[PDB]
Symmetry: D2
């Protein structure tokens, strides 16, 4: 897996004193961005080429909460890679504690149309 | 279903020109809140009584994007109701266009422990 | 003034149990959007014309907190209108209580350059 | 000054292709947090002791936009320190370009009342 380390910010919490569930998707985005960057092909460069990654679906299950100032790790793994789509899984740990498990599925678009995942992208996803 | 109507705000979009996927979960939260308020039992009243609803998992499938200033409707439906949990489904439409389909599963805690869903809550969920 | 009415959502709060200060700027945005819409010229239509409103500065002072489920009103007023800029003030009330006071200053851009505020926009700001 | 380094995330942008103005205040919060942590007194420790910092006002002037994937630095400086309040200033740079200049003013509360800033806090602010 690819490991992405992160500390919870105050604005990411809500009145329940935990990180709002919607923010977990933002953390997963950050992990995907760091993954691509680590492979030498950041998403920002794909966008410059006219490529868009489009989210098809997203799932998260929440096991234990994150609190303000918690340090956690997102373990990202490529789960599925087909002609037109790819799927990442995520496991969120705080130290030894499993906080959450998730996945997202994506496709790619160029010039308003769905395109087969380019070879240049397949090379970095793998 | 219960219908919640909402207009996309500029800050809810990202550089792709669409509503960021994480914001859909915020729209679903707003829908649930309005649903409970419509039954005469707002979540804020539950909280004041020391009850807390805990999200167990969330899933969203994205079909067509939402843009700035789009008016849309979330069709909220109770899908499951058991002794300890409940599940809502959501279908998002913009005019006639299916935008997204989602669900969330929840339980309830009081004094730091999982509790069976109070009869007072059961009566408003159904 | 123009009055914009709003209820606090759960995700707008933080662990302190109040609405995070950064969200007040989002509320002011919503008020400006509703103001323009009420005048028959929504910002979305300005954007379609290639116009961008650019924020120059923003100030907020916080007097009393907003809590989850509070209903409040933003009183928006046009404070300053010059050739290239305009300034709105905002006062946030919850019932009789003054919650916050703010202002924002803006200019306009078209085709990458600062432009005099168009007559078509001056007519709706006034 | 204290220097806080940060990369713009995709969800922090809006449809204009720039970082939404409200997110700048979130960056300033992150900077303050890191500053206190660097002094060996994180805000989370203050909170655990029952202290709360309260924002009184915030101001930001926007000079040049931030884009997705931009690396920037917030230069944080203590500007004022009195018996009951303190003020930070912030200058945001991306490479050599001044992006924004800001300030925030704060006080402290304990048991629901304004308190003079504890000597333990004074020692880390300075």
């Amino acid at each position: 897996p690819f490991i992405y380390r992160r500390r919870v910010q105050f604005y990411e919490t809500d009145a329940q004193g935990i990180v709002h569930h919607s923010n977990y998707f933002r953390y997963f985005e950050e992990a995907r961005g760091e993954f691509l960057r680590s492979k030498g092909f950041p998403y920002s460069k794909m966008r410059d080429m006219g490529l868009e990654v489009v989210l098809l679906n997203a799932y998260c299950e929440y096991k234990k909460p994150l609190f303000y100032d918690d340090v956690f790790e997102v373990h990202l793994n490529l789960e599925e890679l087909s002609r037109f789509t790819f799927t990442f899984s995520y496991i969120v740990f705080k130290e030894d504690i499993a906080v959450a498990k998730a996945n997202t599925k994506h496709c790619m678009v160029k010039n308003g149309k769905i395109v087969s995942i380019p070879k240049e992208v397949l090379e970095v996803l793998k």
